[PDB]
Design a protein around this ligand. Structure first.
Ligand SMILES: Nc1ncnc2c1ncn2[C@@H]1O[C@H](COP(=O)(O)OP(=O)(O)NP(=O)(O)O)[C@@H](O)[C@H]1O
Ligand SMILES: Nc1ncnc2c1ncn2[C@@H]1O[C@H](COP(=O)(O)OP(=O)(O)NP(=O)(O)O)[C@@H](O)[C@H]1O
Ligand SMILES: [Zn+2]
Length: 291
């Protein structure tokens, strides 16, 4: 059963309960549809002076199939250090990623290879499948959530949290996730699934390898009509393996799509042939670009 577990409290193993006064505000790290992410410094405690990223929400819950904030930890997913509730607000204290997002780093290159993208896509695959094994769907996957650490290893900004903004204005008009990366069944309000994450994954791959989105229109309904019905030519400058992976990921019907049964059929793909997956998971594979 899809179970909603509300996030009200969390203190990392071996540390003390936190409160907003223990955090000094330094800068705005950015702004997303669930609000701004700020940069804060721990003023007191064993980790005093250390930098963290702070998200401020009204509330956040986690939908899991069949402690969990400890299980979601992954080499390529941000770590939840603190979490607390004051004045109807939920503060989340996470890792501060110093590399910025990936697309920004790619645009700092005149050119890149299929291998460079393959690295990031691989680590991303590990993260996604790890979330799926816990029974978690990432719901809203988009480049803005894919950042780099100081070294260049992938780090996601979230782990499938169902969040709620504090801005009453915007949140009253808030509408789910990002349409460009929506799966055809998600567009059809059939509900999110594991396979939709892999559709979005395929859209990310396409966007990285082409620099363009496969489906985008003048508005939401046109983009959706495109995702559902429009034609999509295969970029002939891609390797056979890449074309294969894209062809297998882009399936409008899930359970006909790659990864609907396991990521093992994604790990074995000829596109990921020279990828040592355990060394990848151990962050022992040298990243293509330093942030
Ligand atoms: N842990 C982090 N460390 C450093 N910068 C971060 C971190 N998390 C987010 N950012 C920055 O903050 C901006 C928005 O982050 P994000 O995590 O997407 O906010 P959000 O609440 O998830 N809104 P949304 O992007 O719509 O889901 C991005 O431009 C990032 O550069
Ligand atoms: N862990 C999960 N496993 C399976 N299905 C899920 C899971 N989490 C959510 N869903 C499905 O996705 C839907 C959740 O979206 P819903 O709450 O109806 O509106 P929504 O705005 O699209 N959700 P959200 O993106 O979190 O704001 C439900 O209809 C579920 O069937
Ligand atoms: Zn949704």
């Amino acid at each position: 059963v899809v179970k909603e577990i509300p996030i009200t409290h969390h203190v990392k193993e071996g540390y003390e309960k936190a409160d907003p006064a223990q955090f000094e505000l330094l800068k705005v790290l950015g702004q997303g549809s669930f609000g701004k992410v700020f940069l804060v410094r721990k003023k007191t405690g064993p980790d005093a002076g250390q930098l963290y990223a702070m998200k401020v929400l009204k509330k956040a819950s986690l939908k899991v199939r069949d402690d969990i904030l400890v299980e979601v930890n992954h080499p390529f997913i941000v770590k939840l250090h603190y979490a607390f509730q004051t004045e109807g607000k939920l503060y989340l204290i996470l890792d501060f990623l110093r590399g910025g997002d990936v697309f920004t780093r790619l645009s700092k290159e005149v050119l890149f290879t299929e291998e460079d993208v393959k690295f990031y896509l691989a680590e991303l695959a590990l993260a996604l499948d790890h979330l799926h094994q816990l029974g978690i769907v990432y719901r809203d996957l988009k480049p803005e959530n894919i950042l780099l650490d100081e070294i260049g290893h992938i780090k996601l900004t979230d782990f499938g949290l169902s969040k709620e903004s504090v801005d009453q204005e915007k949140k009253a008009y808030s509408f789910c996730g990002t349409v460009e990366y929506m799966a055809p069944e998600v567009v059809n309000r059939r509900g999110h699934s594991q396979s939709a994450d892999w559709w979005s994954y395929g859209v990310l791959m396409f966007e990285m390898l082409t620099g363009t989105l496969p489906f985008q229109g003048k508005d939401r309904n046109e983009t959706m009509n495109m995702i559902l019905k429009a034609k999509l030519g295969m970029p002939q400058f891609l390797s056979a393996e890449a074309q294969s992976l894209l062809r297998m990921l882009f399936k409008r019907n899930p359970a006909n799509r790659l990864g609907s049964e396991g990521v093992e059929e994604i790990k074995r793909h000829l596109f990921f042939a020279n990828i040592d997956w355990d060394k990848l998971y151990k962050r022992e594979v040298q990243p293509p670009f330093k942030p």
